[PDB]
Amino acid sequence: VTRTAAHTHIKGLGLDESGVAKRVEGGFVGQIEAREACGVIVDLIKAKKMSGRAILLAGGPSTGKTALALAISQELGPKVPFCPLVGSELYSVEVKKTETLMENFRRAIGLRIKETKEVYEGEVTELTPEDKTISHVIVGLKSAKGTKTLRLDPTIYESIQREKVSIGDVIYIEANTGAVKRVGRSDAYATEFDLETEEYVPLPKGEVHKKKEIVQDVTLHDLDVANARPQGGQDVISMMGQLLKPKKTEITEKLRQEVNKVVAKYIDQGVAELIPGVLFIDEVNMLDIEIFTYLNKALESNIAPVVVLASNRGMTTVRGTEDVISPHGVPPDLIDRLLIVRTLPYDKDEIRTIIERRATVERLQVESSALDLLATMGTETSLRYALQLLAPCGILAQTSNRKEIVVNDVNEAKLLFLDAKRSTKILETSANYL
Amino acid sequence: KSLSLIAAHSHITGLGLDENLQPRPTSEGMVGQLQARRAAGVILKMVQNGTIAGRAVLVAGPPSTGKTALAMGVSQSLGKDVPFTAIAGSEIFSLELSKTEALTQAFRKSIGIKIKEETELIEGEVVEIQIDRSITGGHKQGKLTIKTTDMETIYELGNKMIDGLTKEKVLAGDVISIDKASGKITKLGRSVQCPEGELQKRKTVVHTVSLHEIDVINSRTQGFLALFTGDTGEIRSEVRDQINTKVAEWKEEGKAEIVPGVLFIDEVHMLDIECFSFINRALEDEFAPIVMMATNRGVSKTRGTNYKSPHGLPLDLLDRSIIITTKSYNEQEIKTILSIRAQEEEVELSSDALDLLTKTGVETSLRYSSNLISVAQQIAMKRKNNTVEVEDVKRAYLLFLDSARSVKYVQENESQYIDDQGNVQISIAK
Amino acid sequence: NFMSIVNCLMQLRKVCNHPNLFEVRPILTSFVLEHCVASDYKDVERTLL
Numbered sequence: 044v045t046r047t048a049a050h051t052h053i054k055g056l057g058l059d060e061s062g063v064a065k066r067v068e069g070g071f072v073g074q075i076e077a078r079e080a081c082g083v084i085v086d087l088i089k090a091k092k093m094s095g096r097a098i099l100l101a102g103g104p105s106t107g108k109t110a111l112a113l114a115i116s117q118e119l120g121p122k123v124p125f126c127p128l129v130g131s132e133l134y135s136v137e138v139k140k141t142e143t144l145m146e147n148f149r150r151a152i153g154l155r156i157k158e159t160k161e162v163y164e165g166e167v168t169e170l171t172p173e174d175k176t177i178s179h180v181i182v183g184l185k186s187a188k189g190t191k192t193l194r195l196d197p198t199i200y201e202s203i204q205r206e207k208v209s210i211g212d213v214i215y216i217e218a219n220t221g222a223v224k225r226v227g228r229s230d231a232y233a234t235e236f237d238l239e240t241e242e243y244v245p246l247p248k249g250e251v252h253k254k255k256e257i258v259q260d261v262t263l264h265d266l267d268v269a270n271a272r273p274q275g276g277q278d279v280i281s282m283m284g285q286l287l288k289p290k291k292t293e294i295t296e297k298l299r300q301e302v303n304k305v306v307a308k309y310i311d312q313g314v315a316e317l318i319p320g321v322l323f324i325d326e327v328n329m330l331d332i333e334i335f336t337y338l339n340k341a342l343e344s345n346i347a348p349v350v351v352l353a354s355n356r357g358m359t360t361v362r363g364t365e366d367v368i369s370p371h372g373v374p375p376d377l378i379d380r381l382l383i384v385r386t387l388p389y390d391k392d393e394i395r396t397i398i399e400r401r402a403t404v405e406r407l408q409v410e411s412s413a414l415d416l417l418a419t420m421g422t423e424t425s426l427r428y429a430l431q432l433l434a435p436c437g438i439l440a441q442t443s444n445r446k447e448i449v450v451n452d453v454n455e456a457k458l459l460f461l462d463a464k465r466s467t468k469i470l471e472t473s474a475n476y477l
Numbered sequence: 478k479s480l481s482l483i484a485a486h487s488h489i490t491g492l493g494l495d496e497n498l499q500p501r502p503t504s505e506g507m508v509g510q511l512q513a514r515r516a517a518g519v520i521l522k523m524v525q526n527g528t529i530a531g532r533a534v535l536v537a538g539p540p541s542t543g544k545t546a547l548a549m550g551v552s553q554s555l556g557k558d559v560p561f562t563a564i565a566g567s568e569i570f571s572l573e574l575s576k577t578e579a580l581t582q583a584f585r586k587s588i589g590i591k592i593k594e595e596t597e598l599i600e601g602e603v604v605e606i607q608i609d610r611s612i613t614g615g616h617k618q619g620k621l622t623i624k625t626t627d628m629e630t631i632y633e634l635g636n637k638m639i640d641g642l643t644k645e646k647v648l649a650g651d652v653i654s655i656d657k658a659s660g661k662i663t664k665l666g667r668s669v670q671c672p673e674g675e676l677q678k679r680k681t682v683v684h685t686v687s688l689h690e691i692d693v694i695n696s697r698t699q700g701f702l703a704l705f706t707g708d709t710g711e712i713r714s715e716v717r718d719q720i721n722t723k724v725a726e727w728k729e730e731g732k733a734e735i736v737p738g739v740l741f742i743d744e745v746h747m748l749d750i751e752c753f754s755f756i757n758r759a760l761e762d763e764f765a766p767i768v769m770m771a772t773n774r775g776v777s778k779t780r781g782t783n784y785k786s787p788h789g790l791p792l793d794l795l796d797r798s799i800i801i802t803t804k805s806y807n808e809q810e811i812k813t814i815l816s817i818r819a820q821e822e823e824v825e826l827s828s829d830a831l832d833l834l835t836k837t838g839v840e841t842s843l844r845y846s847s848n849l850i851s852v853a854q855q856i857a858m859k860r861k862n863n864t865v866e867v868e869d870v871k872r873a874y875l876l877f878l879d880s881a882r883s884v885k886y887v888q889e890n891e892s893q894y895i896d897d898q899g900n901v902q903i904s905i906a907k
Numbered sequence: 908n909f910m911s912i913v914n915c916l917m918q919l920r921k922v923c924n925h926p927n928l929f930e931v932r933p934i935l936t937s938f939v940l941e942h943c944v945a946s947d948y949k950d951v952e953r954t955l956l
């Protein structure tokens with residue numbers, strides 16, 4: 044019914060209008076500074092003015108950095124574009140990591156447009172040249188409420204020849220795009236043959252010419268791929284244009300200058316509205332020194348929005364460097380333009396509320412003795428081992444036909460499943476590399 | 478209407494120097510660094526002179542000094558019609574393109590060529606259109622009347638005039654402007670239009686094109702598709718040699734004049750030694766633009782070798798280059814820079830918030846205060862007043878932590894964070 | 908009025924059973940960007956060639 048995978052219990056940060064964060068609100072217990080400061084970051088994205096700001100989230104495991112990342116991604120809403128990304132994913136062999144990094148900086152930003160398109164539909168009456176010719180075809184579309192004849196290009200006529208239409212077939216033709224879809228044979232010719240593979244559709248109601256306006260949103264990187272390589276078409280020249288060089292290449296700066304030039308012309312006409320977004324990079328310590336040094340100049344660039352990082356290390360060696368020792372795996376020049384939000388750990392009662400609220404979201408019933416036992420396992424092995432063992436206790440409750448988690452079920456979970464320190468303690472004694 | 482939101486490098490507009498090249502204290506967004514702005518003005522009049530070439534310069538210094546902001550001031554004071562190429566040091570590393578040929582591509586991208594010619598234009602109001610064709614044969618015969626304030630005549634049209642006149646919809650009320658050499662029609666206005674002047678006028682058109690564009694165009698036909706799609710690389714040098722002799726012949730004939738542009742390379746410390754020796758040869762070529770470099774690292778080991786060379790660059794590069802250095806700023810100049818960032822960001826600040834923000838800008842860094850000025854207006858904005866208070870700066874200080882403070886927090890919590898060997902205490906007890 | 912109430916509720920009654928509110932679902936065809944950046948430089952290709 045409802046799939047829960049270490050998430051979906053958080054519906055945002057849950058802050059007040061004054062700013063003060065509650066103790067128990069929105070799937071969060073404790074962590075006041077990262078939630079309230081994270082809401083300051085939420086308003087900072089809602090400013091639509093700031094750019095180049097980089098805020099890393101540094102902390103230990105089971106502390107709530109990625110959960111805070113889903114808290115800001117849920118607090119922003121669907122209208123603000125969110126780009127999840129891992130630093131291990133930026134390595135590519137088709138192009139460099141620079142093109143994927145700056146390309147992702149063009150993936151964070153969004154831009155909503157509004158445009159009107161013309162819709163034509165009707166039953167095909169005549170396909171004939173004009174009177175003399177170079178071979179164009181007047182297509183007489185018979186609609187219900189009107190009958191009109193229209194002259195078309197040879198390419199859309201070629202797609203009309205592709206759709207195998209004839210006299211008396213309902214088609215769908217778009218003016219600005221040129222795409223052709225056939226609905227089927229009209230209902231007037233259903234009695235011509237007793238059995239036919241072509242389905243019989245009724246006549247389309249309404250006029251021949253129709254107009255509507257869409258508030259469709261499309262990312263600026265999608266306009267960059269639309270400016271980079273040919274995608275598809277229904278003709279041979281467009282499909283071979285796709286088939287010839289479909290391998291993605293690096294993009295020059297002048298192309299982005301013309302893209303945001305005509306985009307700036309669209310925002311000068313009042314049509315579109317520029318809204319920034321979020322590029323969230325997971326495991327920043329796995330990045331190379333080249334991506335760090337291009338992040339130095341990339342954060343000095345203009346269009347780079349509020350980028351949130353997540354690094355789970357300290358004074359370690361940077362990847363790509365031999366003797367450089369720096370905090371968080373980040374070079375000190377990039378760490379100078381970074382902002383650190385320290386994550387706070389959780390007590391025994393806060394582990395009890397994590398297991399409690401995770402149990403209520405997981406729709407399992409836990410008794411108080413098993414809740415205190417899972418609290419002691421939360422303060423003995425790990426948090427992820429108790430949250431990992433919430434489900435097998437309910438499974439053993441289902442096999443034992445019980446509706447609540449008991450002491451013998453979680454002790455049977457202790458016997459059937461082992462944690463880290465029992466695994467290391469068992470693997471310490473070896474006959475032949477146990 | 479160059480696209481301009483609030484950048485770190487948006488307030489700097491021009492170098493801001495006098496006629497005697499002595500820099501003012503507060504001029505055109507740049508405050509301080511008198512010797513760096515004066516020497517950068519010597520580079521500015523070096524590009525504006527254009528009689529010399531093949532020179533490399535370097536701008537060095539500690540962080541929070543603005544060497545990239547100084548080169549931004551040079552590029553902003555350079556003005557239009559002069560090409561400026563700003564590339565990264567790690568941008569030359571590519572898989573489809575070699576690093577040396579990409580560096581040669583940047584060296585061809587830096588210098589442009591101005592070529593001018595004259596064309597004729599007939600602009601005037603249409604009175605009526607009377608074409609003549611045949612129902613079976615063809616061979617269209619067009620006639621229309623063109624009118625202005627002091628001329629009104631009937632123009633007979635050819636085949637291509639009715640081809641462009643019927644492929645583009647036009648009326649009697651609609652007004653056209655026809656070029657004779659191009660053959661395309663400009664349907665400008667209908668009866669915007671309100672025209673004056675003579676009917677047929679001749680004006681000059683000037684086009685600016687860099688040498689790299691001529692290199693990939695004269696490489697092959699699909700080098701234009703590689704000019705847009707970016708799938709170029711590794712051009713044969715016969716195009717470069719014959720294009721150099723053709724450009725020199727265009728300079729000798731007086732047909733094409735060239736503009737010496739500036740090549741700016743950011744983060745030049747992590748560059749390969751092959752590109753270093755390639756710059757060591759390419760600085761002595763005839764068509765060699767002025768190169769400005771910004772070495773950002775310190776003394777370390779160069780990539781490609783084992784020894785720790787000083788400056789991060791070999792001495793063959795630094796022998797043929799001039800070096801400008803920058804120094805740290807005073808306490809008053811940080812308050813002045815935060816004041817002009819308050820003027821750029823349109824943020825009204827108080828005196829005590831500027832004093833405490835100046836103190837925490839001296840203590841921590843320039844960039845942290847340059848972002849605390851941004852968030853302080855929004856902690857103030859949540860209180861529904863435009864005035865920034867000291868409580869917003871203190872809250873923005875306790876919320877957004879410095880790097881050294883969380884370095885102390887990391888060193889206090891090393892059991893929480895994962896170590897170099899992958900060991901991490903994810904539990905609390907035992 | 909009493910007519911604007913019923914004439915306002917007949918749209919929601921024209922929504923809850925079946926979306927008969929003019930029923931136009933967009934066909935989601937591509938964008939109509941007509942600029943074609945290369946055509947602004949095609950004349951430069953003509954002058955250089």
Ligand SMILES: Nc1ncnc2c1ncn2[C@@H]1O[C@H](COP(=O)(O)OP(=O)(O)O)[C@@H](O)[C@H]1O
Pocket residue numbers: 049050070071072073074102103104105106107108109110111355397
């Ligand atoms: N304050 C909190 N309240 C509720 N659950 C939390 C909290 N902090 C962490 N968690 C839970 O811990 C789990 C793992 O944490 P995670 O975000 O993966 O840590 P990290 O970001 O260090 O990898 C998440 O599924 C999340 O539900």
Ligand SMILES: Nc1ncnc2c1ncn2[C@@H]1O[C@H](COP(=O)(O)OP(=O)(O)O)[C@@H](O)[C@H]1O
Pocket residue numbers: 343485486506507508509510538539540541542543544545546773814843847
């Ligand atoms: N002379 C100056 N005038 C105005 N701002 C400056 C100046 N020098 C440095 N800055 C500030 O320094 C910041 C960028 O420093 P940067 O040029 O990146 O240093 P580096 O090049 O050493 O990394 C900018 O936000 C800018 O406001």
Ligand SMILES: [Mg+2]
Pocket residue numbers: 108109325353
């Ligand atoms: Mg994580």
Ligand SMILES: [Mg+2]
Pocket residue numbers: 545744771773
């Ligand atoms: Mg720099």
Ligand SMILES: [Mg+2]
Pocket residue numbers: 757758
């Ligand atoms: Mg030499």
